A paper describes a structure:
The MSMEG_4306 gene in Mycobacterium smegmatis encodes a protein of unknown function, and its homologue Rv2229c in M. tuberculosis has been shown to be essential for survival. Amino-acid sequence analysis of MSMEG_4306 does not indicate statistically significant similarity to any protein of known function. The crystal structure of MSMEG_4306 reveals a long coiled-coil helical domain in its N-terminal region and a zinc-ribbon domain in its C-terminal region. However, considering the near-identical domain organization in both HP0958 and CT398 to that of MSMEG_4306 and the near-identical function of HP0958 and CT398 despite low sequence identity (26%), we predict that MSMEG_4306 might be involved in secretion systems, possibly interacting with multiple entities (proteins or nucleic acids).
Since the two homologues are likely to be too distantly related for successful molecular replacement, we decided to solve the structure of MSMEG_4306 by experimental phasing. Taking advantage of the presence of zinc ion in the MSMEG_4306 crystal, as confirmed by an X-ray fluorescence scan, an X-ray diffraction data set was collected at a wavelength corresponding to the Zn K edge using synchrotron radiation. Here, we report the crystal structure of MSMEG_4306 initially determined by zinc SAD phasing at 2.8 Å resolution and subsequently extended to 2.6 Å resolution. The structure of MSMEG_4306 was solved by zinc SAD phasing using the CRANK2 pipeline as implemented in CCP4. CRANK2 was able to locate one zinc ion and built a partial model for MSMEG_4306 with five fragments totalling 227 residues and identified the space group as P3121. The partial model thus obtained was further refined using REFMAC5 and phenix.refine, and the model was built manually using Coot. By assuming the presence of one molecule in the asymmetric unit, the crystal had a Matthews coefficient of 2.72 Å3 Da−1 with a solvent content of 55%.
Numbering used by the authors: 1 to 85, 92 to 239
The structure:
């Protein structure tokens, strides 16, 4: 097989454009901005998990102060209902009121302990809300930089796509087809002959085949014996 040397040089640039598009696709899946957004999202979920755990403890303490204040109201109402006054049975109410006054005091002790504990946890929850709010703000900053990097990679991809479309139209389709058949093997399809090493698979070509490669004409097309990529000189 043979092909004009002018289009063989176009095939070399064509293999260069394909390599650049490969790095663009690789960069789109390995962005540094995406890694930054992954970190901020992780620790934002950390505070969201701690905020949810604090909400459970606050619900439990809210249920305690609701049960405490309700039982004191029953003792307070019983003290006020019995406050409205038989003198023989009056002493019977005096001994009960003293025992109920001891119950209202003992209940107020437990109520102040859980009110302090609720006041401490509401401050901790307030400290985590400030923390997750600051994390969320720069999370959107990382999200705008992640999206801004994707539109730059896509813009550079479209420009290399237009350059690739122009090169294929300038080469005989019989040569472009062989380049695609070699890429279907996983190789680079076309690479330069750098000294004695292939520019694609990076092998060291033996002295035997290389003696025949240097003897081929300019219009001739040659491939690497190990990978098959079209060697260009
Ligand atoms: Zn090769």
């Amino acid at each position: 097989m043979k092909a004009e040397v002018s289009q063989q040089r176009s095939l070399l640039t064509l293999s260069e454009v394909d390599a650049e598009l490969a790095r663009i696709a690789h960069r789109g899946k390995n962005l540094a901005e995406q890694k930054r957004l992954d970190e901020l999202t992780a620790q934002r979920g950390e505070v969201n998990d701690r905020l949810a755990a604090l909400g459970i403890a606050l619900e439990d303490l809210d249920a305690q102060v609701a049960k405490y204040e309700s039982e004191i109201d029953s003792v307070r109402q019983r003290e006020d209902r019995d406050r409205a006054l038989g003198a023989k049975q009056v002493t019977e109410i005096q001994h009960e009121l003293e025992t109920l006054q001891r119950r209202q005091a003992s209940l107020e002790e437990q109520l102040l302990e859980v009110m302090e504990r609720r006041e401490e946890l509401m401050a901790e929850r307030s400290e985590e809300l400030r923390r997750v709010d600051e994390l969320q703000t720069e999370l959107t900053e990382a999200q705008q930089a992640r999206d801004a990097a994707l539109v730059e990679l896509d813009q550079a991809r479209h420009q290399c796509a237009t350059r690739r479309d122009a090169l294929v139209n300038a080469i005989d389709d019989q040569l472009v087809e062989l380049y695609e058949k070699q890429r279907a093997r996983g190789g680079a399809g076309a690479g330069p002959l750098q000294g004695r090493r292939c520019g694609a698979c990076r092998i060291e070509i033996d002295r035997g085949e290389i003696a025949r490669i240097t003897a081929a004409a300019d219009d001739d097309v040659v491939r690497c014996p190990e990978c098959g990529a079209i060697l260009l000189r």
